[PDB]
RNA sequence: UGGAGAGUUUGAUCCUGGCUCAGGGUGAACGCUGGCGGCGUGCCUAAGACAUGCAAGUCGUGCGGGCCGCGGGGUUUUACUCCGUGGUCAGCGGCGGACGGGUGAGUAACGCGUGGGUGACCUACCCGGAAGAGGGGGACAACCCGGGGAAACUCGGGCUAAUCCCCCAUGUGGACCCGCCCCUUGGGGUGUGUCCAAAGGGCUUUGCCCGCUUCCGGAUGGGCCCGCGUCCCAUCAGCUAGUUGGUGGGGUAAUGGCCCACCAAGGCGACGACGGGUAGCCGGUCUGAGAGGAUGGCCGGCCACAGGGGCACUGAGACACGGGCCCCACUCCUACGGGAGGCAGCAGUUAGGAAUCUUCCGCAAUGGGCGCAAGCCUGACGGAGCGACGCCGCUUGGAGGAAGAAGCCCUUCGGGGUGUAAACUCCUGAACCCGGGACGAAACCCCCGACGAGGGGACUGACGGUACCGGGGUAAUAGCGCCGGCCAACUCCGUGCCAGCAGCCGCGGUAAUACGGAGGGCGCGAGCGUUACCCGGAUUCACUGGGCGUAAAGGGCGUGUAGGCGGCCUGGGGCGUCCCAUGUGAAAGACCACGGCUCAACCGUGGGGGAGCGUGGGAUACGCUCAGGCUAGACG
């Protein structure tokens, strides 16, 4: 069945497209500990209906573009930037770990 | 290859009596009955406390040297025994005992195992009618091991089977001295066999 | 088209085929679509030919084309007997 | 010193020229139609559109276009023509365009 | 049903710790040795270069001819010309040449694996169902005539058939635009308008066969997409402009920046982007008690490639190993303008290498292409050949033989050992010689029947006069390593830190069980050793299963980001977690059982499993999440 995923909209600076961050949890194959890895999906939002901070369902779809095979199925829960926050920061720390400038 | 060579020296090294000759092994000429000490220029010297290894080696070498089987064949049987269900030691002895060349010896068609081997290779034996000349052929419970009809009139088979008139046969077998045939009733139980061998040590030798 | 034929499986001088449904283009001993029987040309045992005639009829009903030998074997097992 | 299947190469070349030609026609008329429609010439543009439609379906009879390739072309054609017309309007000869 | 440890740091000890050995394995190679058979297996290096032969054709029941030949006609005869027929040759036309066979270069990727999606798709031949095939027109080879070239081959003119091409018709139907209905991504229906069909051949010739057209469906095969999984280096940290997305096009069977205009300014990254290295992936395989480690040869599946790079044509399908075009490197031909070619098909040659086979037989069998069929093609395959390369089976003899020959070796010089071993005696009788001699092969076809069901008959064997059965019948290959400890097996002589051994510890400088020989002994046996490499032992990368005061190991200290982790009570949710059912988990392999070759190796049949993932249903203790509460943590 068309895979359905739930996630948070972390970007919407694109036309009719939003970025959804989907987390997942599983037992490390050798160390057991439940670890939590995640991935971002560019989902189709033709009505520009979804905004930053929405937790949405996403459904496997027919290609809309390269790098874009999912459509926003529906809104699960509105606004909640606490999630958008983790992301933004986790990305900001990247500056402070190379050779140039950054923030601690 | 099945060895082929001085067999009494094998008795002398194992210190026990193996019957690689049938008669003579019951006679005051048995060598074991007049030189129970190992062969070679040191047979009469003071034996040194054997190593745990030596003990296991000597013990297995004894059991194998009894059936005249190759270390190759021998090892394969043991592995097969180890795989099968039930006490490995016994199952091992059952298989070793299910070898036609051995069964032909048990039914007294031959004086020794090495003789029963030749009697098989040369067709003088039969299994359920059809002849078999594979010393390693595995007799199953219910089979009938007989002498080849064309062979029933052999100076050697005459003697051997005559001498059988009167002798007893293993509880797992059953001879018929008249028709020159017998049957493998069932796999011999450990108790039925009275070999001067501690199969327990053997299983350990292959554990190393 | 898809066929019903014999795939070789025994050993040298010891042939044992498998009556099989496969695409005509596949190598003979390759991935078949279904096994519907077997055949021992040397009748080494009382059971030298078995054919799932209910299944044979199915494939035949969908286009499967049998070899002349496969057909011969299927017939022997009453695949076409309409009596 | 070789295979008489050089024949397939000869055949291919004729088949190639045969296709190339059927298509050139299709394109040329297709444009002609789109152009007339764009200029408001309805009766004229539809008239030509039908040839195009016919040539396309015909090309599909054999292995020139075949498939849904014709379908695709007819579609894109009738759409561009119907739309270009509607920007002045009045589909006269009511050629291939359905009511 | 599954888990052994030992040697070596010290005067001695305990610990830490590395090193080494014993086991199993290999597409092996090397040394000494080498008898038979079955099965399997054999360029691991130069994806280097290749002589030669063969490796993909087939239809005359689609069509018209040329050449060679025979026969029969029209005439009073010749000439000229009509018809029938045999051989042969290509040509036009069709189906196949996209399979089968080879390789592993490239590739760290939706390539592969596993599970899903396609309302975003195609599928020749095969099957089922519905409908149909009326009329007309045309061209190019062949052939004929002429020009050009050394050749390859080429330019021009002329005639001609068709299941070749085209036009009109018929419209079951189908396609397209617009509308409406259901349905929900482009799915199904309906209406008007437009557009779209066809090929004939064979007869046992007036009724069948083979074939043709359109459409719906099946079946098989395939495209594209998505989740998760897939090595090393962070002494690679930032990467990106078709880049990320949008609108409109183009393109395709089809989605998509796949491509193109134009607009936006995005996308990716420590959960490792980008870069560098290495590498086809899998079923499996080897090892291991397991977890795991290593691996991907044979066989089966997928992918990629076909001298190197790029490209499209034809077609249901190719961007095409034995098709085409261009560039490059190379080999060959050249009358110097210009041509020909590609073994990673089978066999073979050459080069490289420690190392990897026959220029074999057959198309009898299974499978494939074309054909109505007869049949043709098939280096696919079925066989044989070579190589102990591996596995299994087998032989070199069996029984009797001295308080024990000789020779040889020790010796307390009494005697001890090789040893019942030998010679001998009797018995059997591998090899070899005769006779017989096979399964694999019954279909296709023909006859009857209805070209069906059913029944009947005929042909056909490479392997091979092989397997195997019967008769006769000789007593007739044994080697290799080791013997100081680990490690099973000891003495003399020789040598004198020499010659040498050596896996680790070490051994040899005058009486060495350690070097060399001999006698004796242990191990294994058509083999035995060696080298190399993988796992093991090694809980020595420790998840199972380790450590850091002094053995290697605490960061010089704080502050703090991400992240990891989180006190007590109640409630909702049910993501983790657990349960049930279900689908998937090819075959081979592995396990068990029965069975076929006299056994076994090998093989057949059957059975049992299986983690993971999809779907439906359920549980809610713990973890998570949301909501509320608390005060024992923390803070004030
Ligand atoms: K940045
Ligand atoms: K069908
Ligand atoms: K054409
Ligand atoms: K070569
Ligand atoms: K792809
Ligand atoms: K002519
Ligand atoms: K011409
Ligand atoms: K209509
Ligand atoms: K179809
Ligand atoms: K399909
Ligand atoms: K599919
Ligand atoms: K677009
Ligand atoms: K474990
Ligand atoms: K691995
Ligand atoms: K691997
Ligand atoms: K693996
Ligand atoms: K056919
Ligand atoms: K019949
Ligand atoms: K014989
Ligand atoms: K002899
Ligand atoms: K000396
Ligand atoms: K000394
Ligand atoms: K010595
Ligand atoms: K020595
Ligand atoms: K190791
Ligand atoms: K320190
Ligand atoms: K520091
Ligand atoms: K709850
Ligand atoms: K295993
Ligand atoms: K499940
Ligand atoms: Mg937006
Ligand atoms: Mg995900
Ligand atoms: Mg057991
Ligand atoms: Mg042709
Ligand atoms: Mg033009
Ligand atoms: Mg040490
Ligand atoms: Mg030391
Ligand atoms: Mg140690
Ligand atoms: Mg020290
Ligand atoms: Mg010391
Ligand atoms: Mg072990
Ligand atoms: Mg040699
Ligand atoms: Mg062979
Ligand atoms: Mg190679
Ligand atoms: Mg050539
Ligand atoms: Mg040929
Ligand atoms: Mg011809
Ligand atoms: Mg292939
Ligand atoms: Mg290779
Ligand atoms: Mg590769
Ligand atoms: Mg890379
Ligand atoms: Mg996938
Ligand atoms: Mg689909
Ligand atoms: Mg049909
Ligand atoms: Mg005509
Ligand atoms: Mg000319
Ligand atoms: Mg002309
Ligand atoms: Mg109609
Ligand atoms: Mg509609
Ligand atoms: Mg309609
Ligand atoms: Mg009209
Ligand atoms: Mg028409
Ligand atoms: Mg007709
Ligand atoms: Mg588009
Ligand atoms: Mg499109
Ligand atoms: Mg792009
Ligand atoms: Mg940027
Ligand atoms: Mg590579
Ligand atoms: Mg372990
Ligand atoms: Mg195992
Ligand atoms: Mg394992
Ligand atoms: Mg393979
Ligand atoms: Mg090459
Ligand atoms: Mg085709
Ligand atoms: Mg095409
Ligand atoms: Mg090709
Ligand atoms: Mg390709
Ligand atoms: Mg080639
Ligand atoms: Mg060389
Ligand atoms: Mg054939
Ligand atoms: Mg055939
Ligand atoms: Mg003597
Ligand atoms: Mg003797
Ligand atoms: Mg005899
Ligand atoms: Mg005799
Ligand atoms: Mg034939
Ligand atoms: Mg007839
Ligand atoms: Mg008839
Ligand atoms: Mg019949
Ligand atoms: Mg010892
Ligand atoms: Mg001296
Ligand atoms: Mg010297
Ligand atoms: Mg000395
Ligand atoms: Mg000693
Ligand atoms: Mg030594
Ligand atoms: Mg380990
Ligand atoms: Mg641990
Ligand atoms: Mg430690
Ligand atoms: Mg320290
Ligand atoms: Mg400190
Ligand atoms: Mg702190
Ligand atoms: Mg924190
Ligand atoms: Mg808690
Ligand atoms: Mg937390
Ligand atoms: Mg749940
Ligand atoms: Mg399941
Ligand atoms: Mg399986
Ligand atoms: Mg059996
Ligand atoms: Mg099975
Ligand atoms: Mg399970
Ligand atoms: Mg569930
Ligand atoms: Mg609940
Ligand atoms: Mg809760
Ligand atoms: Mg709370
Ligand atoms: Zn004795």
CATH of the domain at B47: 1.10.1050.10
- Structurally, how many domains does chain B consist of? 2
Rounded to whole angstroms, how far apart are CA atoms A5 and A19?
13
Rounded to whole angstroms, how far apart are CA atoms B199 and B62?
10
Query: C69 lies in which domain range?
Result: 1-83
3-state secondary structure of B96: helix
- Structurally, how many domains does chain C consist of? 1
Identify whether the C-beta of residue B159 lies closer than 8 Å to the C-beta of residue B111: no
- B49 labeled binding residue: no
* Residue B91 buriedness (CB in 10 A; 0-12 / 13-18 / 19+): buried
Do B172 and B205 lie in one domain? The reply is: no
Residue for token pair 């809309």:
A64
Do B50 and B81 lie in one domain? The reply is: yes
- B11 labeled binding residue: yes
Determined by X-ray
Do B110 and B159 lie in one domain? The reply is: yes
Output DSSP code: residue B189.
Answer: P
- B84 labeled binding residue: no
CA distances to D18, D59, D88 from D11, in Å: 10, 18, 49
Domains of chain D: 1-99 (1.20.58.110)
* Residue D48 buriedness (CB in 10 A; 0-12 / 13-18 / 19+): buried
The resolution, in Å, is 2.5
Q: Which residues of A6-15 are buried (b: 16+ CB within 10 A; e: fewer)?
A: ebbbbbbeee
CA-based Rg of chain A, rounded to a whole angstrom? 16
Identify whether the C-beta of residue C19 lies closer than 8 Å to the C-beta of residue C4: yes
CATH number, domain containing residue C59? 3.30.1320.10
Rounded to whole angstroms, how far apart are CA atoms D23 and D13?
15
List the chains bordering chain B where 3 or more Cβ pairs fall under 8 Å. none
Do B89 and B2 lie in one domain? The reply is: yes
- We find that the CATH architecture of domain A1-104 is Beta Barrel (2.40)
Helix H, strand E, coil C: the string for D45-73 is HHHHHHHHHHHHHHHCCCCCCCCCHHHHH
Tell which residue, B106, B89, B107, B58, has the closest CA to residue B203.
B89
Range A49-53, long-range pairs (CB < 8 A, 24+ positions) = A50/A9, A50/A12, A50/A18, A50/A75, A51/A9, A51/A12, A51/A79, A52/A9, A52/A10, A52/A11, A52/A12, A52/A81, A52/A84, A53/A8, A53/A9, A53/A78, A53/A79, A53/A80, A53/A81, A53/A83, A53/A84
CATH number, domain containing residue B113? 3.10.290.10
Do B146 and B69 lie in one domain? The reply is: no
Q: What tokens does D13 get?
A: 């070349």
Identify whether the C-beta of residue D84 lies closer than 8 Å to the C-beta of residue D58: no
Which pairing describes strands A68-77 and A34-44: parallel, antiparallel, or unpaired?
parallel
CA distances to B101, B153, C52 from B98, in Å: 9, 27, 41
Which pairing describes strands B130-131 and C37-39: parallel, antiparallel, or unpaired?
unpaired
Question: Who contacts B1 (Cβ-Cβ below 8 Å, separation ≥6)?
Answer: B70
Rounded to whole angstroms, how far apart are CA atoms A40 and A5?
11
Q: Which residues of B165-179 are buried (b: 16+ CB within 10 A; e: fewer)?
A: eeeebbebbebebee
What's the CA–C1' distance between A3 and E298, in Å?
Answer: 41
Identify whether the C-beta of residue D53 lies closer than 8 Å to the C-beta of residue D74: yes
Query: B77 lies in which domain range?
Result: 1-96+194-208
Output DSSP code: residue A89.
Answer: H
Q: Which of the nucleotides lies closest to C21 (Cα–C1')? A: E220
Tell which residue, D27, D55, D53, D44, has the closest CA to residue D85.
D44
Question: Who contacts D61 (Cβ-Cβ below 8 Å, separation ≥6)?
Answer: none
Q: Which of the nucleotides lies closest to C65 (Cα–C1')? A: E126
Beta strands per DSSP E along chain B: 125-127, 130-131, 144-147, 175-176, 181-183
Rounded to whole angstroms, how far apart are CA atoms C11 and C9?
7
Rounded to whole angstroms, how far apart are CA atoms B65 and D47?
106
């Amino acid at each position: 069945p068309k895979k359905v995923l739930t996630g948070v909209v972390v970007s919407d600076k694109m036309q009719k497209t939003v970025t959804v961050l989907v987390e997942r949890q599983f037992p490390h194959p050798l160390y057991g500990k439940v670890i939590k890895r995640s991935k971002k999906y560019l989902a189709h939002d033709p009505e520009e209906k979804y905004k930053l901070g929405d937790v949405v369902e996403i459904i496997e779809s027919r290609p809309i573009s390269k790098r874009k095979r999912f459509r926003v199925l529906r809104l699960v829960e509105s606004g909640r930037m606490d999630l958008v926050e983790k992301y933004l920061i986790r990305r900001q720390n990247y500056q402070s770990l190379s050779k140039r400038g950054g923030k601690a | 290859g099945r060895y082929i060579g001085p067999v009494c020296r094998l008795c002398r090294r194992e210190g026990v009596k193996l019957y690689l000759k049938g008669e003579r092994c019951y006679s005051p000429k048995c060598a074991m009955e007049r030189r129970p000490y190992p062969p070679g220029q040191h047979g009469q010297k003071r034996a040194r406390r054997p190593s745990d290894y030596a003990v296991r080696l000597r013990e297995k070498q004894k059991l194998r040297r009894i059936y005249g089987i190759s270390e190759r064949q021998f090892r394969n049987l043991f592995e097969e025994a180890s795989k099968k269900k039930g006490v490995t030691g016994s199952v091992f002895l059952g298989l070793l005992e299910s070898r036609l060349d051995n069964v032909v010896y048990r039914l007294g068609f031959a004086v020794s195992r090495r003789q029963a081997r030749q009697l098989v290779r040369h067709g003088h034996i039969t299994v359920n009618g059809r002849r078999v000349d594979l010393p390693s052929y595995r007799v199953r419970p219910g089979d009938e091991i007989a002498v080849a009809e064309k062979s029933r009139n052999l100076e050697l088979i005459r003697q051997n089977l005559e001498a059988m008139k009167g002798r007893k046969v293993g509880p797992w077998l059953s001879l018929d001295v008249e028709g020159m045939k017998g049957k493998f009733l069932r796999l011999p139980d450990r108790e039925d066999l009275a070999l001067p061998v501690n199969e327990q040590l053997v299983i350990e030798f292959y554990s190393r | 088209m898809v066929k019903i034929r014999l795939a070789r499986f025994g050993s040298k001088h010891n042939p044992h085929y498998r009556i099989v449904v496969t695409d005509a283009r596949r190598k003979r001993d390759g991935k078949y679509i279904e096994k519907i029987g077997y055949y021992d040309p040397r009748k080494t045992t009382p059971d030298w030919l078995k054919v799932d005639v209910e299944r044979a009829r199915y494939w035949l009903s969908v286009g499967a084309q049998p070899t002349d030998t496969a057909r011969r074997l299927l017939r022997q097992a009453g695949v076409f007997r309409q009596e | 010193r070789n295979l008489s299947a050089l024949k397939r190469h000869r055949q291919s070349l004729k088949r190639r020229l045969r296709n190339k030609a059927k298509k050139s026609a299709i394109k040329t008329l297709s444009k002609k139609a789109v152009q007339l429609a764009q200029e408001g010439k309805a009766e004229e543009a539809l008239k030509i559109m039908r040839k195009a439609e016919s040539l396309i379906d015909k090309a599909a009879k054999g292995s020139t276009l075949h498939k849904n390739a014709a379908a695709r072309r007819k579609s894109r054609l009738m759409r561009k023509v119907r739309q270009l017309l509607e920007a002045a309007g009045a589909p006269l000869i009511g050629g291939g365009l359905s009511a």
